[PDB]
């Protein structure tokens, strides 16, 4: 599959309705809502080697397995907090107790002296619009300071045509007078490349 | 010493929301909406538009304590009508009047 | 004051001369060295936060530097030599060989044991590090036989204080002893608990602080910096407080400082005419508008500038709470004083009030667990505290009456035990019996 | 009597004349640091085991 | 997670007798299993103030990652053609889903019946990127490899969440593999509890197990200092 | 050694330990400690 | 239909206009928003290197905090908490510095124009000290004599007046309505007569007396407002009014968006 | 002291009016109210600042550092 | 010396001090895991439970009223008329 | 005198007291620093094991936390340096010392304290700043004024003494002093001067303000009373909107010189079923008089609803007074 995240900074809380009405001629079906969190941490160590990132990204996907990917220095880390996603080989041998938890709780409780929670973005009340071979999800970003921006998630199972779809999405973004935006669609696992699109799209 | 930070007067705290819709049992079809990090500036402006409507029977607001940025808005409309719709019409009317005030203000400013 | 080391100083930021000035001030150097500021004052019953000599001050005026003052605290330390053999030395104490070291931080000290000026310091911070030599065979208490070296005896900053060290100087005194004086400055922003006075006997603290949009305003646009309660005036019968406000308004409009001498020919009607010539109301009233609703007030407000002064009394030097602290050495009771972390006194009248309410359990708890509670053993034959108690093996005796079986246990306050022991030292027997022999 | 004013004289006369104190006075119970017969403490609270089976 | 464990130790001769005893008691044959555990200690080259952002003291603790591995990588050449059961113990791009855990010091209390220990656990599913190795991930978090040990043994499944781990433990190094439990087998009896009634009921289960096994094998309570993984 | 400043003439002494307390070139025993060479952060509020 | 604005006086500092056809709640809300809910740029952190002045350090930091700055393109400068960097960056704040040293025997005066911009603006027009003096000299910060240096670095950050009074672009706002008392909102106090004691306001020229002997007023509402806005020097008056109306519109729209999600 | 910045009420900048004020007083010999009328101050809230200011920095600078 | 039930000549009404110490001691016992005789309506505070037991006279106590001559009486809180 | 009859004790705080009309009659505003300094030892029970566990997991730095734990063995573990250990689980029978939260009765006192009313219990309300906030209907038995006066606050350390202190010492339970068989607490200062102007015949309030006045009442039933004048324009009188603050079921009558059923001078007082018929409320009606309104409600509807009467009356009269406006100039003394 292919994914592409486009972040619109100069956006309004009503821009999601404008872009939603722009695609009314291609909406086939609407699925269940989705939620995602984006936490940005900072290293607290006073001794780091040359050329190294001082921030640690964390992207928590809701209902996508209740997962959390940690990104630092172009590296990923797929973690989970649900007990149903634990392989039976880790429970049968006794290596897993059976009741996991979020990694952000450990990073904010046990490892808080090394990594401190700097930025927090909570994204709820999403919309899953299914088009003609492209699943576009819309969500608004809200931080402690209020409204942040617009987040666009593009996921398509077709590995062939994909540039025309994102080009059309950017066209509809240009029709709603939504100028100045960052388009991310790079790679490094689909969830790792997607989370990397979130990092390259939100930084 | 012990006084709270100044930026807390307008920034929303963690684990909180902007509006707290709480049904009221003092009168039929009555609701109390709690407003956070606001004062009389929004409460009186909303209450006025709530009083300009004919579907609203009762409408008031109050600031419980000046040391906390919050105020309660008690609304009570007629049977068969929701106060949330009246609040939406109030917000739309305020946005329209402010937009006409900005357009007319700029138009009159371009003549000086 | 920049070249002196005075203890407990308070220098106002923007000292302002009054408007209604007296001629005698010219001979008292008051216009050159004023002790207050002129503040726009309204006399009204606003949000009820003005009652009982309470005042509401504008927050935006406070943020712009109104009645803000500086406090300079000087800590003077000196090293001494008893019999030349023991010599106190100013130095940075090491946490390895120094005993009796305070829990404060020693990172702000230099190599000589002092804090250079400009370093921001807070409470429980050592300003001057001083150590005293000790003898190994003199005390040997705890770990004194391991530290070997010296004992800490530094002079830290106050527990509740904080600020920026202004100036530090070192000098030899009369007999050649190297002493050092320190001076730390701290800006004390006017708080709600701070007290303010005027030039008419009117004194009172701040009730609450509001912002410009929360303060009433006139039709012209002048916001009061301080509002007081009308009920101050009639009872106290200070009419001069209104005449100084009116004449201060006329002086603020005309630009000439009004003469406020005692025995002159200046009347109130003339000041009313001079104010009437400037366009305002001759009686000092002015139409005010509400700050919350923006609606005109039904009654006009007496509105005008008035000279005010800030007193030494502040809340930051008064508030204190104690929950299990240090006790005295004599009575083993909570100490006296805020600097020593002392508790409040539950005097005799308070106990009499507790008896008036009929609460004996709160009295017993307040006079035992809340203060001091001691456990002693008395003998059955004689009611004196001669019962030697060696309870590591559960053993008891009472000397002089042949008892090793019947020993009673009682809980009495330590002060009562001091009374009984002083009576025994005064040849008086306070025999205590748990049973009623008289019946 | 000694608590009010002249403490030492009253105490000395007490010890001299072999005086006995009943120790139900207010100040006496205060000094010794235990419950006095005033208000709540002017009556004892008991338990009835025949009432627990009710 | 609150784990309540009682340990023991047997020899190389009473292995069949203990397997037969626990087989007749639990009514189920033992299940052969193994697990590798790697311990990551804080990097000595890095120095960080042991204090949180709220001015609170922090105690350094080691991080233990455990996983599984089939016996095809454990059986050599002289072990082939043998029954795959409990009688074997007598003859002795991306990253794998690791199990990250931190164990704390057990609770205090003299004359205690069980050994309660608080252990945090999160599941490391996978990773990607340039430094996708788990070692480089731990180095990115601020931990380096200290030691590792591979344990192979048998486990039982009774009632009320009780586990009996009769296992041997070896230290995996380059110079050689030294057997820590040389001469016998290590016995374990732990229950994983996610309430006071359930904790006391678990203690009742462990006391019933010790009372039932009284006379044969003794299950005492280990020292707290023997289960403290803090760095000093 | 640490840098010191004279009372009156305000000269840079920088005398070490075991040198008593006295200015060179003049007899003013008042010796200043001078301000720290590191930055101090303040807030305008 | 809606409100109408008739500007009477238009200057560089004071602008008086008439805002009518507005319920008292929208006028009071407008002046409250213009006084409070408007962003501004002011100095938030003062780093003092060397200071030999007779004034206190935090005193000079206070005076520097009260100094106004230009704040036009402040809309696209993010807040300090909103930016994900550590401390600051060319997205949140503007870096300034001051170096003063007494030269000749006559005392040297430190002005606000002595501040220079050493940080990149990325095309913005903020950070310039507002000079409104007729002689071309900035705000007199402090005085210095020969032998005293003053070097410091200030960090100008964005903020509204709710955080501190230094972020106050607007000044005295002249609010008035109903010149000739006909709405019966104020009962004038009089010793002999209210017409001989209370003078007439200026706005009375734009209306007429209600005439004695006419029926009582009870059905007339409060309208025809007289609003005089005064800017200190940061942003012009049209940006104050427009940014205030857009501020209240973003607040009401934020409440509508907060109600839609329920 | 040394010219209070802004004002303690309205908020208008006055620090740049001191030098002119004295300049109007020592050169034109005008009164205080006339000079305050030339600076642009129309409210007494500002007038009390310049009128009641006691500049003590001049007496502070006469000390040698 | 324990006056009998037919000779108890004290006030049958429970005073404010007796109610106070009964609610205080009863609430103190309830705080120390005492058998509650009344079904709770969801309370958590011990004083509210003690007042709930006093409202139904389910408190198992009896008051020993001391007389000035040294005697006493036994008035159970169940037979005492509250308020 | 200094060691037996009296003594310096712990668990107390002394600071400057100030007024706050938004608070209740029996409450007192305690600063956060005092609430974090003083403590109270609570017993761990299955009813609050989760809450006390949260207080332990919060830490002494946060206000909803604890300071020390006391095991059943009689040993105290400090929460400080206990986080270095890791986890602390509570059991049944322990005593965890928490901070002073809300609804905690503590004794309030002011020297020299010559009344039994000078020391009265109060309900703690945590508020910022550093001054003790309290209602102005309690400054008359304390003989205090908000001009630098400091007061003392004592905290009980046991549940038995807290319950005995709440059932014997209370502000509602001390409205009518036995000194002169008349209420010692009443409406003083600006509220008494404002209620008179509110109870005038010329006092009329519009609908938009009457709604806020009725909503400022905490125990308002939500039924808007019929205005006194309908068409032209609905107008409410001060006695009508003020009668809502008075609880129903109160009857009172007071006749003076020249007082008649019509009362042209508006003298006397008449209230039937909690509704003011005629009479201007002043010192001889709501003040500290013998046959006053507070003395009738205190003996009719008990001390609880009477304790709510101070709050309702103060909120209504103050809310009408901040919009009405009052001052005092020099023209009041001009003849
Ligand atoms: Mg006093
Ligand atoms: Zn004896
Ligand atoms: Zn020299
Ligand atoms: Zn930034
Ligand atoms: Zn001004």
Topology:
This is part of a larger assembly, with 10 protein chains of 9 kinds.
Chain D: H1 7-16, H2 26-32, E1 44-46, H3 49-52
Chain E: E1 2-11, H1 15-26, E2 31-42, E3 63-67, E4 98-103, E5 115-129, H2 134-141, E6 143-157, E7 163-171, E8 178-179, E9 184-193, H3 196-212
Antiparallel strand pairs in E: 1-5, 1-9, 2-3, 2-6, 3-4, 4-5, 6-7, 7-8, 7-9
Chain F: E1 5-6, E2 31-32, E3 40-43
Bound molecules: magnesium ion and zinc ion (ZN) (4 copies).
PDB class: transcription
Keywords: transcription initiation, transcription, macromolecular complex
Entry title: structure of yeast transcription PRE-initiation complex with tfiih and core mediator
Task: Name a few traits of the molecule.
part of a larger assembly; 10 chains; A: 203 residues; alpha+beta; eleven-stranded antiparallel β-sheet; 23% helix; I: 83 residues; Eukaryotic RPB6 RNA polymerase subunit; 2 strands; elongated; binds magnesium ion; binds zinc ion; transcription; transcription initiation
Strand content of chain H: under 5%
Given this structure, which CATH class of chain H is correct? Mainly Alpha
How widely separated are the two ends of chain E? 25 Å
Q: Which pair of protein chains has the largest interface, and what are the residue counts? A: C-J, 91 and 77 residues
What does this structure look like?
This is part of a larger assembly, with 10 protein chains of 9 kinds. Chain A has 203 residues and is an alpha+beta fold. Helices cover 23% and strands 36% of the residues of chain A. The radius of gyration of chain A is 18 Å and the shape is globular. With 45 residues, chain F is mainly beta. Chain F has one domain (3-45): RNA polymerase ii, chain L (Rubrerythrin, domain 2, Single Sheet). Helices cover 0% and strands 18% of the residues of chain F. Chain F is built from no helices and 3 strands. A two-stranded antiparallel ribbon of chain F has the order 1-2. Chain G folds into 2 domains: 1-39 and 166-262, RNA polymerase, RBP11-like subunit (Gyrase A, domain 2), CATH 3.30.1360.10; 40-165, RNA Polymerase Alpha Subunit, Chain A, domain 2 (Beta Complex), CATH 2.170.120.12. Chain G has helices spanning 24-35, 57-66, 194-197, 237-260, and strands at 4-10, 14-20, 39-51, 94-101, 108-111, 116-117, 140-144, 149-160, 174-177, 225-230. In chain G, the strands form 3 sheets. Chain G has a 4-stranded antiparallel β-sheet, with no helix packed on it. In chain G, strands 3-8-4-6 form a 4-stranded antiparallel β-sheet, covered by helices on one side. Chain G has a two-stranded antiparallel sheet with strand order 5-7. In chain G, helix 1 packs across helix 4. The two termini of chain G are 32 Å apart. Chain I has a single domain (1-83), classed as RNA polymerase subunit, RPB6/omega (Eukaryotic RPB6 RNA polymerase subunit), CATH 3.90.940.10. Chain I is built from 2 helices and 2 strands, in the order H-H-E-E. A two-stranded antiparallel ribbon of chain I has the order 1-2. In chain I, a hairpin with a 5-residue loop joins strand 1 (62-66) and strand 2. At the C-J interface, strand 15, helix 5, strand 21, strand 22 and helix 7 of C face strand 1, strand 2, helix 1, strand 11 and helix 4 of J. Chain G: Keywords: Acetylation, DNA-directed RNA polymerase, Metal-binding, Nucleus, Transcription, Zinc. Chain G: GO terms for molecular function: DNA binding; DNA-directed RNA polymerase activity; metal ion binding; protein dimerization activity.
């Amino acid at each position: 599959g292919k994914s592409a995240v486009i972040f619109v900074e100069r956006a309004t809380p009503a821009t999601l309705t404008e872009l939603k009405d722009a695609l009314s001629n291609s909406i086939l079906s609407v699925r269940d809502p989705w939620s995602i969190d984006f936490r940005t941490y900072r290293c607290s160590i006073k001794n780091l080697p040359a050329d190294v990132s001082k921030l640690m990204y964390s992207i928590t996907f809701h209902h996508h397995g209740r997962q959390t990917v940690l990104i630092k220095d172009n590296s990923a880390m797929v973690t989970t907090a649900a007990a149903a996603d634990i392989p039976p080989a880790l429970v049968f041998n006794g290596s897993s107790t059976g009741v996991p938890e979020s990694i952000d709780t450990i990073l904010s409780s046990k490892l808080s002296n090394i990594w401190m929670q700097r930025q927090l973005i909570k994204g709820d009340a999403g919309e899953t619009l299914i088009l003609d071979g492209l699943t576009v999800r819309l969500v608004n970003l809200f931080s402690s300071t209020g409204f942040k921006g617009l987040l666009i998630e593009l996921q398509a199972d077709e590995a062939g045509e994909f540039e025309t779809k994102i080009a059309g999405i950017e066209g509809h973004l240009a029709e709603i007078r939504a100028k100045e935006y960052k388009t991310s669609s790079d790679s490094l696992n689909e969830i790792c490349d997607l989370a990397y699109q979130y990092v390259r799209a939100l930084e | 010493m012990n006084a709270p930070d100044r930026f807390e007067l307008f920034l929303l705290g963690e684990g909180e929301s902007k509006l707290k819709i709480d049904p009221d049992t003092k009168a039929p079809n009555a609701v109390v909406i709690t407003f956070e990090k606001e004062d009389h500036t929004l409460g009186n402006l909303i209450r006025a538009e709530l009083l300009n409507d004919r579907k609203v029977l009762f409408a008031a607001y109050k600031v419980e304590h000046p040391f906390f940025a919050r105020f309660k808005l008690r609304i009570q409309t007629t049977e068969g009508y929701d106060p949330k719709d009246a609040l939406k019409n109030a917000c739309n009317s305020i946005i329209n009047k402010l937009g006409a005030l900005k357009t007319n203000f700029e138009t009159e400013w371009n003549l000086q | 004051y920049n070249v002196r080391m005075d203890t407990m100083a308070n220098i106002l930021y923007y000292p302002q001369k009054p408007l209604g000035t007296t001629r005698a001030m010219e001979y008292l150097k008051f216009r050159e060295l004023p002790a207050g500021q002129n503040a726009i004052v309204a006399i009204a019953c606003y949000s009820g936060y003005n009652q009982e000599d309470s005042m509401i001050m504008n927050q935006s005026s406070i943020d712009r530097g109104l009645f803000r003052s500086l406090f300079f605290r000087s800590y003077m330390d000196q090293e001494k030599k008893y019999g030349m053999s023991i010599t106190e030395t100013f130095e940075k104490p090491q946490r390895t060989n120094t005993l009796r070291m305070k829990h404060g931080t020693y990172d702000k000290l230099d190599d000589d044991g002092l804090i250079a000026p400009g370093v921001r310091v807070s409470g429980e911070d050592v300003i001057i590090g001083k150590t005293t030599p000790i003898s190994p065979d003199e005390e040997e208490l705890g770990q004194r036989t391991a530290y070997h070296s010296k004992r800490d005896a530094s002079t830290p900053l106050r527990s509740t204080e904080n600020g920026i060290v202004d100036q530090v100087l070192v000098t030899t005194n009369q007999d050649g002893l190297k002493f050092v004086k320190v001076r730390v400055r701290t800006t004390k922003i006017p708080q709600i608990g701070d007290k303010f006075a005027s030039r008419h006997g009117q004194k009172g603290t701040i009730g609450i602080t509001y912002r410009r949009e929360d303060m009433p305003f006139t039709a012209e646009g002048i916001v009061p910096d301080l509002i007081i309660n009308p009920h101050a005036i009639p009872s106290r019968m200070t009419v001069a407080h209104l005449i100084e406000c009116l004449l201060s308004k006329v002086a603020a409009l005309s630009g000439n400082e009004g003469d406020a001498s005692p025995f002159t020919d200046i009347t109130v009607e003339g000041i009313s005419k001079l104010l009437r010539e400037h366009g305002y109301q001759s009686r000092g009233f002015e139409v005010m508008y509400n700050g919350h609703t923006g609606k005109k007030l039904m009654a006009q407000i007496f509105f005008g500038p008035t000279y005010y002064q800030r007193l030494r009394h502040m809340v930051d030097d008064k508030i204190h709470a104690r929950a299990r602290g240090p006790m005295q050495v004599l009575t083993r009771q909570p100490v006296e004083g805020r600097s020593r972390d002392g508790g409040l006194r539950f005097g005799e009248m308070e106990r009499d009030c507790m008896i008036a309410h009929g609460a004996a359990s709160f009295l017993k708890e307040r006079l035992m667990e809340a203060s001091d509670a001691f456990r002693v053993h008395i003998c059955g034959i004689c009611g004196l505290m001669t019962v030697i108690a060696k309870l590591n093996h559960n053993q008891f005796e009472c000397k002089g009456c042949d008892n090793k079986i019947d020993i009673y246990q009682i809980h009495i306050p330590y002060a009562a035990k001091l009374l009984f022991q002083e009576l025994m030292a005064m040849n008086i027997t306070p025999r205590l019996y748990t049973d009623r022999s008289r019946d | 009597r000694c608590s009010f004013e002249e403490t030492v004289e009253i105490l000395f006369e007490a010890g001299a004349s072999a005086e006995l104190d009943d120790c139900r006075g207010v100040s006496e119970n205060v000094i010794l640091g235990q419950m006095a017969p005033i208000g709540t403490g002017a009556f004892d609270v008991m338990i009835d085991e025949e009432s627990l089976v009710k | 997670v609150q784990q309540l464990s009682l340990f023991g130790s047997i020899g190389d001769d009473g292995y069949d007798l203990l397997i037969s005893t626990l087989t007749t008691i639990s009514g189920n044959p033992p299940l052969l299993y193994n697990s590798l555990c790697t311990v990551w200690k804080p990097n000595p080259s890095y120095d960080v103030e042991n204090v949180n952002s709220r001015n609170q003291l922090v105690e350094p603790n080691r991080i233990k990652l455990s996983k599984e591995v089939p016996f095809s990588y454990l059986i050599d050449e002289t072990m082939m053609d043998k029954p795959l059961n409990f009688r074997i113990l007598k003859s002795f791009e991306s990253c794998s889903p690791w199990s990250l855990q931190i164990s704390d010091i057990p609770a205090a209390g003299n004359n205690r019946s069980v050994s309660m220990q608080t252990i945090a656990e999160t599941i490391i599913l996978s990773s990607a990127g340039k430094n996708s190795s788990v070692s480089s991930l731990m180095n990115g978090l601020g931990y380096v490899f200290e030691f590792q040990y591979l344990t192979i043994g048998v486990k039982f499944f009774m009632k009320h969440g009780l586990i009996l781990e009769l296992q041997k433990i070896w230290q995996i190094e380059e110079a050689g593999n030294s057997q820590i439990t040389s001469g016998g087998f290590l016995l374990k009896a732990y229950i994983n509890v996610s309430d006071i009634d359930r904790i006391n009921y678990t203690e009742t289960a462990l006391m019933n197990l010790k009372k039932e096994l009284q006379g044969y094998i003794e299950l005492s309570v280990p020292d707290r200092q023997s289960m403290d993984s803090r760095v000093a | 050694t640490l840098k010191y400043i004279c009372a009156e003439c305000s000269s840079k002494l920088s005398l070490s330990r075991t040198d008593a307390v006295r200015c060179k070139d003049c007899g003013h025993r008042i010796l200043l400690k001078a301000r720290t060479k590191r930055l101090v952060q303040f807030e305008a509020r | 239909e809606g409100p109408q604005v008739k500007i009477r006086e238009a200057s560089k500092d004071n602008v008086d206009f008439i805002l009518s056809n507005v319920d008292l709640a929208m006028a009071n809300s407008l002046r409250r928003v213009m006084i409070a809910e408007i962003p501004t740029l002011a100095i938030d952190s003062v780093e003092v290197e060397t200071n030999t002045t007779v004034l206190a350090d935090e005193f000079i930091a206070h005076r520097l905090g009260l100094i106004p700055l230009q704040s036009m393109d402040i809309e696209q400068l993010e807040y300090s908490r909103d930016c994900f960097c550590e401390d600051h960056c060319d997205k949140c704040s503007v870096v300034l510095t001051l170096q003063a040293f007494g030269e000749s025997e006559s005392t040297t005066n430190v002005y606000s124009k002595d501040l220079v911009i050493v940080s990149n603006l990325m095309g913005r027009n903020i950070g310039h000290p507002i000079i409104q003096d007729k002689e071309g000299n900035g705000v007199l910060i402090c005085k210095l004599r020969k032998g005293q240096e003053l070097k410091l670095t200030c960090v100008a950050k964005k903020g509204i007046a709710k955080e501190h009074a230094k972020w106050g672009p607007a000044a005295a706002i002249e609010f008035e309505y109903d010149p000739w008392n006909k709405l019966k909102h104020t009962d004038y106090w009089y010793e002999q007569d209210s017409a001989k004691e209370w003078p007439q306001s200026k706005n009375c020229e734009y209306e007429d007396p209600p005439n004695e002997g006419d029926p009582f007023d009870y059905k007339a509402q409060a309208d025809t407002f007289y609003m005089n806005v005064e800017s200190v020097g940061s942003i012009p008056v049209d940006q104050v009014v427009v940014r205030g109306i857009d501020t209240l519109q973003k607040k009401v729209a934020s409440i509508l968006l907060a109600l839609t999600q329920m | 002291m040394i010219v209070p910045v802004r004002c303690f009420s309205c908020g208008k900048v006055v620090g740049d009016k001191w030098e002119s004020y004295l300049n109007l007083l020592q050169e034109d010999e005008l009164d205080e109210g006339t000079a305050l009328s030339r600076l642009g101050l129309k409210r007494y809230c500002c007038r009390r600042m310049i009128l009641t200011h006691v500049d003590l920095i001049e007496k502070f600078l006469r000390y040698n550092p | 010396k324990a006056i009998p039930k037919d000779q108890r000549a004290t006030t049958p009404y429970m005073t404010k001090y007796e109610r106070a110490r009964i609610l205080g001691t009863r609430a103190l016992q309830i705080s120390m895991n005492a058998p509650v005789f009344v079904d709770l309506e969801g309370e958590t505070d011990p004083l509210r439970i003690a007042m709930k037991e006093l409202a139904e006279k389910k408190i198992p106590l009896v008051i020993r009223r001391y007389l000035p001559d040294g005697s006493f009486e036994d008035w159970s809180v169940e037979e005492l008329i509250v308020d | 005198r200094g060691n037996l009859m009296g003594k310096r004790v712990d668990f107390s705080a002394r600071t400057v007291i100030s007024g706050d009309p938004n608070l209740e009659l029996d409450q007192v505003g305690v600063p956060k620093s005092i609430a974090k300094t003083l403590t109270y030892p609570e017993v761990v029970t299955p009813y609050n094991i989760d809450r006390l566990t949260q207080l332990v997991r919060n830490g002494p730095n946060e206000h909803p936390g604890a300071k020390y734990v006391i095991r059943d063995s009689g040993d105290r573990i400090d929460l400080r340096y206990s986080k270095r250990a890791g986890d602390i689980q509570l059991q049944y029978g322990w005593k965890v010392e928490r901070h002073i939260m809300d609804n905690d009765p503590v004794l309030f006192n002011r020297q020299p304290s010559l009344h039994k009313m000078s020391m009265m219990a109060h309900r703690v309300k945590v508020i910022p700043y550093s001054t003790f906030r309290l209602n102005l209907s309690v400054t008359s038995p304390y003989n205090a004024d908000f001009d630098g006066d400091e007061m003392n606050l004592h905290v009980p350390q046991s549940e038995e003494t807290r319950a005995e202190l709440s059932q014997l010492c209370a502000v509602p339970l001390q409205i009518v002093s036995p000194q002169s068989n008349k209420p010692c607490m009443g409406i003083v200062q600006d509220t008494l001067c404002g209620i008179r102007k509110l109870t005038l015949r010329d006092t009329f309030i519009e609908l938009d303000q009457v709604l806020n006045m009725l909503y400022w009442v905490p125990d308002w039933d939500g039924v808007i009373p019929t205005p006194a004048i309908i068409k032209p324009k609905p107008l409410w009188s001060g006695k009508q909107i003020l009668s809502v603050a008075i609880p129903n079921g109160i009857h009172l009558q007071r006749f003076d010189e020249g007082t008649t059923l019509l009362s042209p001078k508006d003298n006397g007082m008449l209230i039937i079923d909690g509704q003011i018929i005629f009479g201007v409320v002043e010192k001889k009606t709501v003040g500290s008089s013998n046959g006053g309104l507070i003395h009738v409600v205190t003996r009719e509807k008990g001390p609880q609803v009477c304790a709510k009467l101070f709050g309702n009356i103060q909120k209504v009269v103050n809310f009408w007074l901040l919009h009405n406006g009052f001052s005092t100039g020099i023209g009041d003394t001009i003849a």
